[PDB]
Amino acid sequence: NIYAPLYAPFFGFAGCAAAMVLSCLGAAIGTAKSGIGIAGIGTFKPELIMKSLIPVVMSGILAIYGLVVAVLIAGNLSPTEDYTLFNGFMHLSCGLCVGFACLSSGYAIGMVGDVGVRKYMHQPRLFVGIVLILIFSEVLGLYGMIVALILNTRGS
Amino acid sequence: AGLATVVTFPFMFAIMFGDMGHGFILFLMALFLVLNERKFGAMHRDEIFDMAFTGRYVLLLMGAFSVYTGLLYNDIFSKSMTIFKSGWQWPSTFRKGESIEAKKTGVYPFGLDFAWHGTDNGLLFSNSYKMKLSILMGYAHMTYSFMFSYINYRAKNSKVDIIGNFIPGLVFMQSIFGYLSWAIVYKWSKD
């Protein structure tokens, strides 16, 4: 079969790896850079820490976004079934458009939710705006996951 | 926790440090400190030798168990001991330089068998044995130290802590890794 060559799972497992590595990279930037800002206010008003763990949770959801598409790419890969190069390019693209989506969303959550938590010890009215900017910066990875799911269902 | 440590720490040491030659050296340099503990007690000890002489009885057990387990292995300065009768016989008539197998006659009485020494696939068998050994001894150590939690919650007379932590912990640990440790023994039991 000229449409299903034997090097096609290379681009599917590359889609798995780009969906997992870059999304957990974004999740790790988003949890580490924000945990810096949460622990920075550890002494000055310690009672605002357990309320401020939201940019850590919203960063950890970005790894679930990559986990879902990595499971759904790895479920379409078998050495006995035929696997087109179209399918491999499509899995490469759907991992690649969720990995950098979650990477950018994790950079945005990490840069927002430590400055916000670090200024939140002065003004206690910041929290609604902080959560709102975190929602706007966390739907960035949801957009990429939507594109990845539509692209996975299209390419198979 | 330092009353189950007195056997398990030298024994978990000896599983990692298994050799009758190095074990006898360590037992001998520990017994040198045990027999001379009166001249060394009234003496200024620097920190390294204070560490070594404060534990002159942890090293005696760490040598005494290392001799036992390196007699379970055939490892005497990485050599075998042809003490018992082997469970494997080699063929008598074979060409020089060819790969041959051994036929199983019986089972080796005490410890690992000495026909695995200069063997190509002996290291695969030692990998399987020592991996399953580590799994079963870790299972035994964990399910022994988990009963002490029940004895603690019983001495505190807290049935709420028992039914909330010990029983859902017991039938979670034993239903997965107790089943794994049983399955290793049952695969060893069948032919």
Binding site: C97, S104, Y143, I150, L151 | -
Partner: protein, 158 residues
């Protein structure tokens, strides 16, 4: 010869790029402006919801990337023309690397605008107008990619 087997590669990376670079620009525009929002609403709490307009303005860039990437995704085929893959690659780059530019512009304008609008209340209308001039760049990229994607599969053959 005219619709080769490696032809959906260009359309696939064009569908990827319109999310990658667009979400990168939108993330810059949300992050750098949210730093200014969280830095100026310490002593100006009542301006907390007037200052979200840079962040919303940067989220519309990612919506622009989302629309074009979905509309490219629903034209990828196995027996696809190489012309179609080239057009989808061009339409993906045209949204991605222009939404990155508009996100850079909104991220650099919006934090200065929310830092000056807390000090001067009449600077808010100027901030909104400069952000419209900054968002229209990504709007131009979306216009180019929607006029371009409509030409993929018009006179394709073989």
């Amino acid at each position: 010869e005219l619709c080769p087997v490696y032809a959906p590669f260009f359309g696939a990376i064009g569908c990827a790029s319109a999310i990658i670079f667009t979400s990168l620009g939108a993330a810059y525009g949300t992050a750098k402006s949210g730093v200014g929002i969280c830095a100026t609403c310490v002593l100006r709490p009542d301006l907390l919801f007037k200052n979200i307009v840079p962040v919303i303005m940067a989220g519309i860039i990612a919506i622009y990337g989302l629309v074009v990437s979905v509309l490219v995704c629903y034209s990828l085929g196995q027996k696809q023309a190489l012309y179609t893959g080239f057009i989808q690659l061009g339409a993906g780059l045209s949204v991605g690397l222009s939404g990155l530019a508009a996100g850079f512009a909104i991220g650099i304008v919006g934090d200065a605008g929310v830092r000056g609008s807390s000090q001067q209340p009449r600077l808010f209308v100027g901030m909104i107008l400069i952000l419209i001039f900054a968002e229209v760049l990504g709007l131009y990229g979306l216009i180019v990619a929607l006029l371009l994607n409509s030409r993929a599969t018009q006179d394709v053959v073989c």
